[PDB]
Amino acid sequence: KVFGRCELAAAMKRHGLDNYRGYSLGNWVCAAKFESNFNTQATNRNTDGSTDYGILQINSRWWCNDGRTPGSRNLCNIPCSALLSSDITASVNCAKKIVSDGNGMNAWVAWRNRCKGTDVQAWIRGCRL
Ligand SMILES: [Cl-]
Numbered sequence: 001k002v003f004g005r006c007e008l009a010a011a012m013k014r015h016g017l018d019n020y021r022g023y024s025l026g027n028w029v030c031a032a033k034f035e036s037n038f039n040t041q042a043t044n045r046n047t048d049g050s051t052d053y054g055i056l057q058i059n060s061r062w063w064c065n066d067g068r069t070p071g072s073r074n075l076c077n078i079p080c081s082a083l084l085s086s087d088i089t090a091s092v093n094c095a096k097k098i099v100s101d102g103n104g105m106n107a108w109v110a111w112r113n114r115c116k117g118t119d120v121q122a123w124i125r126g127c128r129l
Pocket of ligand 1: 004
């Protein structure tokens with residue numbers, strides 16, 4: 001599924017991400033934009049052989065099992081394919097674990113490089129939340 005901007009904002013809002021660990025909603029929408037272009041089916045292979053999955057490009061190196069990332073962990077205790085659903089629940093639940101873990105939203109490279117230190121409020125402008 002390719003989410004609309006406000007459609008995803010609203011979905012992230014009702015799943016409790018607005019100001020979760022102090023990260024306003026715009027940060028989560030900005031992250032999803034530049035990780036997946038709002039596409040729940042997005043997958044990308046990393047140079048080390050792990051793969052990033054779904055709307056927030058969650059990495060098989062640490063967070064989910066895809067059975068083809070040798071030596072990796074599955075900290076969210078879920079198959080990586082579950083993170084590709086049209087329903088973002090699994091990605092959000094795993095994201096909440098990731099963001100509570102140490103370096104916060106810096107765990108998302110696209111957030112660090114394209115959202116952090118910018119005005120992200122624009123990402124939820126005009127949305128019914
Ligand atoms: Cl849109």
